């Protein structure tokens, strides 16, 4: 969800 | 209070739109920060106008205000970076990586490192997570759908996304009322008052 | 008296300026083309923001509309070109030469050729017509003086350079009157009511 | 005096 | 006399070619200036290796030595320039125009101006003199035909375009004779004789 | 006694050096692979001519021939990369990283990544291993001392570092002997015999 | 003779 | 002061 990744 | 005046900005927005001053409308949305125009935002993202996209956003939120808005900027700048890689402009890609994406490194080093290493691949589609990115056009559209949701969920945008609905030319209607109030104060009114300006109050005699 | 709309734009301009929406003001000046703001123009010319300068001008005149507006654009693009040569960015200089200055060739073919040939000089001040130039700050200032005269004489700006003079917040003043006109018609009134909104007319009950 | 409306390197 | 040492260079050229040291052959050609190799020149021109072309030529003639050699360099640098325009690298095109072509402006002011103005064309083939150019492959070939003629007429190449004709491995043959002359001054050798090195003269005992 | 060809190359090297054909000397060293010229190598490294350094080296070894030569190339391409960063030509720095440094990732994955990440620093001296670095002049000198040792230890260079020592112009001396051997087979001489050419054997007739 | 030794486009 | 084939910074 709010996670920062590719 | 100013919540009334805040409404005045909205009246002006409608007026501007009716006179078809398009750029002025979006500058006012941005600088007042009262109304975020999705349709416009989408249009600019699809066009890849990143400078304007970030400029319009900067009227509403900064990068570190909350996790929603932080992910929003990150997604935008990531796509920016990938497109640079895709046209094999490595000069710009590294420029983006240092100016735009570095701020996110502090919070997660490892992702920044992994993003950095994409510079050295034949095609970033060699990375398994990005293996599915097949177009500039398609990626933008996919990412756009993601952005809409992030924005709608963002607490700072949550009451800014729906334009109030008014009859046509609400401001012109109000202006007209101000002229009636002016003339009703006239001693010796002619039933047909000819109004010379909006700049100073009308009178008769 | 003549256009309700034109007068109303002026009121909005004043409102926007008071609320310090700087960018919105000048987009509206530009898009409406009702008022050309010299102070703004000078500021932007001194800053060398050429893209915006040309954009602002574009609300008023096109490049070939008349000999005045033609010299204005020529001077600006010439200056753009020289600054590029001066910083030894020959990639940009040629780009300017092709994109911006080629249009003037139609008139003085030879002049275009002469301007083109400046590329091959060590320093364009070797050309005796340009021998008095330098540095950038000074050239801009000298040129600005010339631009002002050209603008002031140009038929398309000539009636557009003076802002009407109004009491502060004339727009807010009129808005107030529309509320007075609304409330004076409701029966039977309270002495001092609360305003529900500007979006739909107030009444009492 | 009349402005210079010409187009040249000056 | 150099009428000798010059011949020795040719023998060395043959040796080098036989040992297939290609790059060394052409550096020796260039630095000695004794032999101009057309086949090699054409090959580099076709490849558009312009830096090597000018470097190789520079072993033979400078730009202003005579009208032939001046047209040779002019034609080469012109093509260099056109290719830069054609790949739309205008930064490089101006660099060529200033570094390489400016030398010609002094005696043709007008031509230099005309060449400069090609920068502003959408396509330089809009120029009526250049209206015939396509494509990089073909332009080079046309220009090369011209270059050959220019070189062949150039007085500075006049004794340099034809390789002498020699038996195979002449230098090796000569060296072998030196060993024979060394040994025929010797003392009581058997017909062995054991030759240790070329570095110092042979002797039989010790 | 072993190789005529090989020995002859050295004589030619000496001749070339005496005639001051500098570039030809080093192409021949390179293409023959018989002699690695330390002095030349150091000179080119100090000057930072990297394309040429690698080109010269390639006459003696490929990048992956052994751990010594692999360290040599690695060091050189590393320094190339650092200098690109240091002049802030990040476009070139990335180009070096992809073309030149990627080959070393196979054996070392993490190190390649660590080197990659230097791109994102204000200054690569922020890395504690590199905190010691510059100037450019000094870094080159430091790295060179190391390279010298790597070359001296490398099995492919180890027997190629010492030039034979000869009387000046040994080749010219030998050439003369061949003329003397040619003439001694003459029946019989001109009073002072006259030699027209090296290209075909001399003989004596009135 | 025929080679034109003159410089132009 | 002996073999360093160390591939690193
Ligand atoms: Zn009245
Ligand atoms: Zn009321
Ligand atoms: Zn003997
Ligand atoms: Zn004889």
Give an overview in words.
The complex is a heterooctamer, with four copies of chain A and four copies of chain B. With 6 residues, chain A is largely without helices or strands. Chain A is 0% helix and 0% strand. Chain A has no helices and no strands. The termini of chain A are far apart. With 205 residues, chain B is mainly α. Chain B has one domain (1-165). Helices cover 57% and strands 0% of the residues of chain B. Chain B contains nine helices and no strands. In chain B, helix 5 packs antiparallel against helix 6 (90-99). Chain B is elongated, with a radius of gyration of 24 Å. Chain B starts with a helix and ends in a 21-residue tail after the last helix. Chains in contact: A-B, B-C, B-F, C-D, C-E, E-F, E-G, F-H. Bound molecules: zinc ion (4 copies). One zinc ion is lined by residues 183, 186, 189, 193, 202-204 of chain C.
Biggest β-sheet description of chain B: none
- The domain tally of chain B reads 1
N- to C-terminal distance of chain A: 12 Å
How far the N terminus sits from the C terminus of chain B, by CA atoms, comes to 37 Å
Biggest interface, chains and residues, is: B-C, 39 and 41 residues
Number of helices of chain A: 0
Helix percent band of chain B: 55-70%
The shape of chain A, in one word, is elongated
Largest sheet of chain A, described in full?
none
Strand content of chain A: under 5%
Number of strands of chain A: 0
Q: Helix coverage percent of residues of chain A?
A: under 10%
> What structural category do the secondary elements of chain A indicate?
little secondary structure
The number of E-state strands of chain B comes to 0
Structural class of chain B: mainly alpha
Tell the overall outline of chain B: elongated
SSE order of chain B, as H and E? HHHHHHHHH
**Distinct small molecules:** zinc ion
Family (chain D): Belongs to the Aux/IAA family.
Subunit structure (chain D): Homodimers and heterodimers.
Motif (EAR-like (transcriptional repression)) (chain D): 5-9
Protein name (chain D): Auxin-responsive protein IAA10
